[PDB]
Amino acid sequence: FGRFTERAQKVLALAQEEALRLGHNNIGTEHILLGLVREGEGIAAKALQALGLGSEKIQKEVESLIGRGQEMSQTIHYTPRAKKVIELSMDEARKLGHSYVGTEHILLGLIREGEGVAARVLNNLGVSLNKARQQVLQLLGSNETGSSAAGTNSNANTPTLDSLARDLTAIAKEDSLDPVIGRSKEIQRVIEVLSRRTKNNPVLIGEPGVGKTAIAEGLAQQIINNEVPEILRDKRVMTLDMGTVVAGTKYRGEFEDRLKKVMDEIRQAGNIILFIDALHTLIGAGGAEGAIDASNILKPSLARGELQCIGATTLDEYRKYIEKDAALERRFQPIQVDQPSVDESIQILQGLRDRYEAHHRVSITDDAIEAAVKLSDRYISDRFLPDKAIDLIDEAGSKVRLRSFTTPPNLKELEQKLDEVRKEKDAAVQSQEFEKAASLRDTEQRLREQVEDTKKSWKEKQGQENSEVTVDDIAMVVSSWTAQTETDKLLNMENILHSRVIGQDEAVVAVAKAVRRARAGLKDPKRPIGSFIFLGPTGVGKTELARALAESIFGDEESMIRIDMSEYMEKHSTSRLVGSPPGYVGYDEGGQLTEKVRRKPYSVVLLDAIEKAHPDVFNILLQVLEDGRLTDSKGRTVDFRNTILIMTSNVGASELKRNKYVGFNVQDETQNHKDMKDKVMGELKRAFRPEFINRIDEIIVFHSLEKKHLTEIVSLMSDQLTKRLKEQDLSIELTDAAKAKVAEEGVDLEYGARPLRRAIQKHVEDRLSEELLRGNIHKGQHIVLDVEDGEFVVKTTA
Amino acid sequence: FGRFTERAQKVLALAQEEALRLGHNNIGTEHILLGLVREGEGIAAKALQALGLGSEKIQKEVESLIGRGQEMSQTIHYTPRAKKVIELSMDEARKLGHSYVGTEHILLGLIREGEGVAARVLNNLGVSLNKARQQVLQLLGSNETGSSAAGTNSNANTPTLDSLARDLTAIAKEDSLDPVIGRSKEIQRVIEVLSRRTKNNPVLIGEPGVGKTAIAEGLAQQIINNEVPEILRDKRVMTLDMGTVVAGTKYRGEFEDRLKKVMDEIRQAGNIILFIDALHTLIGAGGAEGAIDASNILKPSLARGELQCIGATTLDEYRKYIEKDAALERRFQPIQVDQPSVDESIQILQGLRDRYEAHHRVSITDDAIEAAVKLSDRYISDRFLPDKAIDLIDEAGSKVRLRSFTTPPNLKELEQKLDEVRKEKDAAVQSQEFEKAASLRDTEQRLREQVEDTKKSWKEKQGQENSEVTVDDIAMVVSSWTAQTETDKLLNMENILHSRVIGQDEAVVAVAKAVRRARAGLKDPKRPIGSFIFLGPTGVGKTELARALAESIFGDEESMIRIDMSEYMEKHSTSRLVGSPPGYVGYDEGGQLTEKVRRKPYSVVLLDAIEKAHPDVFNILLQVLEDGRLTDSKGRTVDFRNTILIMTSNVGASELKRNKYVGFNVQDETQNHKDMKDKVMGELKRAFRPEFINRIDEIIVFHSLEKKHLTEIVSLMSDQLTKRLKEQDLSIELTDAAKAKVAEEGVDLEYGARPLRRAIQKHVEDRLSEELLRGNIHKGQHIVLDVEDGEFVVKTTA
């Protein structure tokens, strides 16, 4: 059963009436047949009354099947047979122009389901099955429920309007024409351009691809009342439809001739409008576009002003029509068809919130719509601004009704049981195993009802909780791509960045806060969500922080571009790093930087070296840093929308290698700390050009090796060990206990913190692998190199 | 013969009954025929009873043949005639709806073979061969059992659901729909995206290619019971299958029209789920050809959510559809399609493992499953993680199943003998040569039984070997490609690496152990199996081990990449000009290093003399050393997973080339040893950054001569000698007795180590060739140039 006619449903339900009244415990086709004759004035019922079959005549046979009867009528739903009649009736209604069904269609449906209960009832009460369907047909057919025309009611238009066309105005007489969504102020802006006749053509420019056609339908409607030029009220809008013209004509040349006929009758000037879509194509000018050079006829028609026409041209194409001249845009003039601006996005969301009705999820909240929009805008950041939006609302917009309804209670197990029976049960009936099948049926059907009750008992768990969707709902979904777990990405950013930076507690927090700030929406949203300079020791946090940003903000390790900006001046790309300068700053702008970042407009852009670089490097960084764009690659816009620009170079490093130890001399520690987290961003300022850098979120200051920043390089090296072992399926981790003992091997007074990986290798990599090869631990489980006695110990976990 | 059911086999066996009972020593088709009529109520028998033939009627004719008879019935098996009939019928039963073989099919098969003994029996007992096949046939056919058809017991759906198309729900009523293997969290994740209707569509992105389609079937099942929300409950699932949609009209226009028709019927209020495969193609966004631009209809329908739909989109294509805007993506949403990672792999293998017993010996054992995955990961290669796996398991699990039946020693030789006889015999009878054939016949039958008895006496060799399939089995198979022969390469690696390393016992063992650890299944699979830095001298050191490693682990000397870092002291590309440089580190990434290792991801990556090269280049290399990947060139990820990265360096070289000799005492051996065992690891740190060195397993130390590293250089050139003649025919050796005498000529204080090729040339090569041209050696003999009396001697050892 589904969305059917009443008439249908009514014959069908009457079957259930017969279920108990005649006692046929499961309702077969016979009851549907009775249903048909029992609705009296239904087209089926009426048909049966012609055939002589009254409710009586049918029922006399039917009661002789089960004769009142199993009045309990156990399993008091249908059997498949009657249900088959419904599938069939539907097809017998499809047959006669009903999406739904009808009383008629079910009687027709009976015939369809031959050698079923209805069918045998009718073959016992005489009545042949096709005589019955006949009877229905001869009280059916010639279906009409429309308006059935009244023709044109103005028609100066005739020589033209024969061809070609429907006319937009026609479809708007009783408004069988969709508006559609706009881009509403654009329709007004079209009517200025429509009120002319050597600028006659509004020329709608925008992606096609946003439902441009809505604005076009706009004109017709607006041309009626109570606002629009009287001259255009005194006009008619006729569409020059390319499709009807090409069909049955099969030539471009012939198509053009028909298009000419339409233009000639347009001599009614001061009364007629032609809409020529792809107005540029017809002009056939510019590029290699010469799709059809209708231009010969079209250009003078527009120019003479004997034609008032409507233009739909493409962004570049319009240029490539007006360039030819000498009265080309004596028609076109552009007006902007909006691709929904960010606020418009919000509105779209809200509009299609409401349509979740069998989908009960978003279905609220305002804030959730906002999250959808806003969160997408800042993070991923790889789609269009309203698409981004709408998607996020629905994204969250099922998830919760589903996580609710993940099983029948936990009574998913019921169904499994009901199976075990069915088998057992089944196999028993074949063996006989009489009462051994018996009790198995009973266990089956026991289960069966029990299943079904609890499969909809978490429809209570829906009606209780399941409309919501909030900011947070959206944020988890936005995070799925990439306002709870989008703002947790922001707020606990520092925690994430510290774990993959060699201390630099200062650096981490500076970046953390700067990105989280921007990513909140109030800083830098077209210019990178972090512009940065990262100064200080490299290896000791710097590169590693760039990595940690890629990971946290964008959701991937390798969502980080990395170009060296000092090479982009050809005064370092003739030298080391980059040997060849094939044009190199030109290579970057014209190619590399712009190309890379346009692919991922949500990635860490890392432009290395910017102190010893020259002012041209800084100009490039500055445009990104102010605007969020560079225009290169012949007018391409590279979207640095919510990239993180990180420009490196260091010159404060030394203090950021003097530590805030513990016990060294407290007055050197607590004056080394504050000093390194200051000195880097001030050592920066003296070498380069300032104009780029001031357009930066925070100028990131790195630190040393503290007591404890040191032990984070030990843990970077140890984390790097543990990371390279996974691909085969050797999952190894060093506990804190082992990371502590391993850290012991990195301190001297005479040695920095970098030798640690190799000794981590000796006691972990080398040691674990030389301990595994024996056959002590399985391949394909977790291997912990731990300390559990003050010495390394390999312990195991899943 | 094949696979047969009883009914068939019974008619056949009744032939054997007749073998002795009629004396048909080998039983022709007539006995099979009699067999047919003699099982009475079998379908063959029944047929024959129609024709009037009883068991009797056949048997009377049959008895008129041999006539009970040769009741010894020598070779109480079938005849070649009957063997054709049995083989024919079996297959003639496959032909007539029966996987195995039925009684009917044997009579039918008899008819097929209608010139045999049966056939003449029947032509003597009147009845025609086709009248008999008629009778059997009419007790076959009119199938439709176990099946019927149904639409949907609603079918509100009709105008759409008629047309056009299969519905997942329909086909799942009896469940004739395969799971398929998941991609399990994806099936859950589908219901997340699909009880959405402004993210209508889950959009499965991944390798196609693993079976995306498994996930799709997920939805169907869960809308029934019960993971689904109440949203996706009260819905029907329809697949938009592209072929019916395009129809016989064979156009894009027709496809769009049918898809539109579904959208109108979508009036079920989002309670219909439509599956649009390749939704991106339909959206028509991306590429220079969209592949139809259905997006226009789909976008308001999806946005309203009235069309609630299921997406299968391709990884990049999907991006190029949600980019289209503005509620296009308010459908699709990406989801990770499982292409098994190593742990997942193990589970997939297992899932179809037991079924490898269709071609027996596998399944078993667990350790082998694990091996399958793990062993591939370190030894061979870039291949997918479950594919790798499953193959090894089956590979070894068969290898041995033949070695059972290849151990009958080579009692295939028995089979060989029996031939010579047959021949002899046959040709002898043809001469007649009666008894002169006799003994040859007899000689055959001796053989025949002997042959066959010992090929299946090693069905004991089946019960012995033919299931076990362990790690060891798997490794042997992994080696077949390239833990028996994957760890034997390792375990004896040091021995193998030393024979082409010029001494440097330190170096050999260091590399040996690190590789042997990793490559035996226990470490470094993501990064190179060994990353290393090698300091040493040359020709008494480093390069020669790089070569020897390539040779031992991967096969052949020249499975070795080779990049010069001295060019990465770059500026060789501005004006000196070096191979295709975008600018030199850009050459390494953009082409040379990444392309070469993508070409061989199963090789020694040799980054020569990292040394004074730019530390930024080392950062690029560092990603290989850590990650085992670079992503460059065109977006390729280069798997250094199954490489052994070897970076050479030297700035300690001199000492590493300076002996280990008794140059002034034996404490000159043991402190020169120690001197070299110091000089590598400190010149390493002095050459370049520690960060580099830190993602390196071991620092490989190369020493020089006790007497002895020198005499190994002599043996490297002398081994190039021992290798080089087999290509043209001949086995050459410089005998060790002579390799010592040749080594005597390489000493001066002021010049040695290098002259050795030449002195081997003069004293060996040259000496042997000027004695071979005379004709003192035959071709393909082993030529040892030896010392036997303190002087060179050419001796031979074949």
Q: Alpha-carbon distance B753 to B746, whole Å?
A: 7
The CA angle B405-B406-B407, to the nearest 5 degrees, is 85
CA proximity to B534, closest of B659, B379, B652:
B652
A252 reaches B (C-beta below 8 A)? no
Mutate to test the interface with B, among A92, A143, A398, A768 (most CBs of B within 10 A): A398
Between CA B225 and CA B221 the distance in angstroms is 6
Residues of chain A with C-beta less than 8 angstroms from the C-beta of B237: none
Query: Which of B151, B327, B523 shows the shortest C-beta gap to A725?
Result: B523
Chain A positions touching B191 (Cβ under 8 A) are 398, 402
Q: For residues B469 and B476, give the distance between their C-alpha atoms in angstroms, rounded to a whole number.
A: 10
Contacts with A253 (C-beta within 8 Å, 6 or more apart), sequence order: none
Interruptions in chain B after residues (C–N over 2.5 Å) = 482
Q: How would DSSP label each residue in B201-264?
A: --EEES-GGGTTHHHHHHHHHHHHSSSS-TTTSS-EEEEE-HHHHHTTTTSHHHHHHHHHHHHH
Q: How far is CA B776 from the centre of its chain?
A: 50
Q: Which residues of B touch A458 (CB under 8 A)?
A: 226
Give the separation between CA A737 and CA A173, rounded to whole angstroms.
82
For residue B411, the distance in angstroms to the closest alpha carbon of chain A comes to 39
- Can you spell out the DSSP letters for B321-333? HHSS-SSSTTT--
Of A489, A640, A476, A485, the closest CA to residue A553 belongs to: A489
Ligand-binding annotation for B206, yes or no, is yes
Mutation target vs B (from A394, A462, A776; most B CBs, 10 A cutoff)? A394
Q: What is the Cα A721 distance to its own chain's centre?
A: 38
Question: Residue A645 corresponds to which amino acid?
Answer: L
Residue A696's φ and ψ, nearest 5 degrees, are -140, 145
d(CA A521, CA A529): 9
Residue B331, min C-alpha distance to chain A (Å): 7
Q: How is residue A511 written in tokens?
A: 């970046």
Residue A634: CB atoms within 10 Å: 6
Cα–Cα distances (Å) from B682 to B18, B535, B657, in that order, read: 93, 9, 16
What the block records as the tokens of A253 is: 């040349």
Q: At what angle are helices B615-626 and A710-724 packed, to 10 degrees?
A: 50
The residue whose two tokens read 């009936």 is A429
User: Nearest-CA neighbor of A277 among A322, A327, A213?
Assistant: A213
Burial B579-598, CB ≥16 within 10 A → b, else e: eebbbbbbbbbbbbbbbbbb
Q: Residue A20, Cα to own-chain centre: how many angstroms?
A: 51
Phi, psi of B595 (to 5 degrees): -65, -45
In Å, how far is A710's CA from the nearest CA of chain B?
14
Q: Look up tokens 């063996």; give the residue.
A: A431
Largest Cα separation within chain B, whole Å, is: 114
- What letter would DSSP give residue B287? S
| Residues B503 and B707: beta-carbon distance below 8 Å | no
Q: Do B373 and A397 touch (CB under 8 A)?
A: no
Q: Which of B175, B267, B330, B647 to mutate to test the interface with A (most CBs of A within 10 A)?
A: B330
**B329, B371, B697 ranked by CB distance to A391: nearest:** B329
Specify the DSSP class assigned to residue B310.
E
Contact A580 B585 (CB under 8 A): no
A387 and B324: CB-CB below 8 Å? yes
- Taking an 8 Å cut-off on Cβ atoms, the answer to whether B522 and A455 are in contact is no
Q: Which amino acid is at B115?
A: E
Cβ–Cβ of B523/A768 closer than 8 Å? yes
- Alpha-carbon gap, residue A56 to B392, rounded angstroms: 75
Amino acid identity, position A273: I
d(CA B307, CA B798): 82
Beta bridge partners of B794: B785
**Which chain B residues are closer than 8 Å to A91 by Cβ?**
151, 155, 158, 162
d(CA A764, CA A783): 10
Whether B226 and A458 lie within 8 Å, measured CB to CB? yes
Contact A397 B324 (CB under 8 A): no
Entry field: residues in chain A: 798
The answer to whether A248 contacts chain B (CB < 8 Å) is: no
Q: Nearest CA of chain B to the CA of A396: how many Å?
A: 8
The CA-atom distances, in angstroms, between A130 and each of A116, A123, A141, A416 are 14, 11, 16, 46
Q: Is A728 on the interface with B (CB under 8 A)?
A: yes
CB distance B371 to B475 below 8 Å: yes
Calpha distance A62→A33 (Å, rounded): 9
Contact A638, A597 (CB under 8 A): yes
**Whole-number CA gyration radius for chain B:** 38
Question: Which pairing describes strands B631-632 and B636-637: parallel, antiparallel, or unpaired?
Answer: antiparallel
The answer to whether B336 faces chain A, any CB pair under 8 Å, is no
Is the N-terminal amide bond of B363 cis, ω within 30° of 0? yes
Q: How far apart are CA A481 and CA B601, in angstroms?
A: 32
CB atoms within 10 A of CB A242: 18
Which residues of chain B have a CB within 8 Å of the CB of A755?
Answer: 690, 694
Alpha-carbon distance of A116 to A81, in angstroms, equals: 7
Closest partner residue to A584 (CB to CB) among B162, B526, B583 is B583
Mutation test of the interface with chain B: which of A724, A745, A778, A794, choosing the one with the most B Cβ atoms within 10 A? A724
Q: CB–CB of B237/B220 below 8 Å?
A: yes
Chain A, window 173-232: residues with a beta carbon less than 8 angstroms from a chain B beta carbon: 180-181, 207, 209-211
Task: Provide φ and ψ at B311, rounded to 5°.
Answer: -110, 135
* Structure tokens that stand for B274 in this block: 């439509």
Determine if residue A536 is labeled as part of a ligand binding site: yes
C-alpha span between B187 and B192 (Å, rounded): 9
Whether residue B212 is annotated as binding a ligand: the answer is yes
Tokens of residue A482, six digits: 């990439």
- Sign (positive or negative) of CA dihedral A102, A107, A113, A116: positive
A658: β partners: none
DSSP for B155-185, written as a single string: -TTHHHHHSS---HHHHTTTT-S------HH
Q: Would you say A543 is a known binding-site residue?
A: yes
Q: Where are the beta strands (DSSP E) in A172-214?
A: 203-205
Cα A555 to Cα A195, A473, A476, A552, B207: the distances in Å are 52, 18, 13, 5, 21
Residue A636: other Cβ atoms inside 10 A = 14
Over A21-63, what HEC string results?
HCCCCCECHHHHHHHHHHCCCCHHHHHHHHCCCCHHHHHHHHH
Question: How does strand A698-700 pair with strand A532-534?
Answer: parallel
Scanning the structure block, which residue is given the tokens 């059963």? A1
Judged by phi (left if over 0) then psi (alpha if -120 to 50, else beta), residue A520 lies in alpha
Contact of B412 with B448, CB cutoff 8 Å: no
Contact between B198 and A391 using a beta-carbon 8 Å cutoff: yes
Q: How far is CA B41 from the centre of its chain?
A: 51
Q: Do A394 and B199 lie within an 8 Å CB cutoff?
A: yes
Is the Cβ–Cβ distance between B34 and B50 less than 8 Å? no
Looking at residue B121, its amino acid is: V
> CA A483, A485, A490, A493: dihedral to nearest 10 degrees?
160
Place of tokens 């190179």: B528
Q: How many residues does chain B have?
A: 798
Distance (Å, rounded) from C-alpha A386 to C-alpha A290? 35
From B154, B200, B697, residue closest to A1, measured CB to CB: B154
Please count the other Cβ atoms lying within 10 Å of the Cβ belonging to residue A773. 21
B623 interface with A at CB cutoff 8 Å: no
Residue from A794, A797, A789 nearest A776 by CA:
A794
Question: How far is A298 from chain B, CA to nearest CA, in Å?
Answer: 28
Phi and psi torsions of B273, nearest 5° = -115, 120
Q: Inform me whether the C-beta atom of residue A343 falls under 8 Å from chain B C-beta atoms.
A: no
What span, in angstroms and rounded, lies between the C-alpha atoms of A729 and B377?
9
Contact A254, A289 (CB under 8 A): no
For B648-794, where are the alpha helices, taking DSSP H only? 653-657, 673-687, 690-693, 710-723, 736-743, 756-760, 766-772
Rg (CA), chain A: 39
Q: Which residues contact A548 (CB under 8 A, 6 or more apart)?
A: A496, A497, A499, A500, A501
Are residues B151 and A724, on separate chains, in Cβ contact within 8 Å? no
End-to-end CA, chain A: 50
Closest CA to A238 of A147, A327, A308: A308
Distance CA B95, CA B109 (A): 10
How many angstroms separate the CA atoms of B367 and B468, rounded? 10
CA distance B39 to B25: 22
Q: What are the Cα distances from residue A193, in Å, to A163, A201, A263?
A: 27, 6, 19
Closest CA to A17 of A39, A1, A48, A50: A39
Pairing of β A563-564 and β A604-608 = parallel
What does the alpha-carbon distance between residue A612 and residue A589 come to, in Å, rounded to a whole number? 19
In A546-575, the residues whose Cβ lies within 8 Å of chain B are: 558, 564, 567, 573-575
Burial code of A35-58, b = ≥16 C-beta within 10 A, e = fewer? bbbbbeebbbbbbbbebebebebb
Assess B403–A contact: CB distance below 8 Å, yes or no: no
Q: State the nearest Cα–Cα gap between B684 and chain A, in angstroms.
A: 12
Q: Which residue has the tokens 């601006």?
A: A341
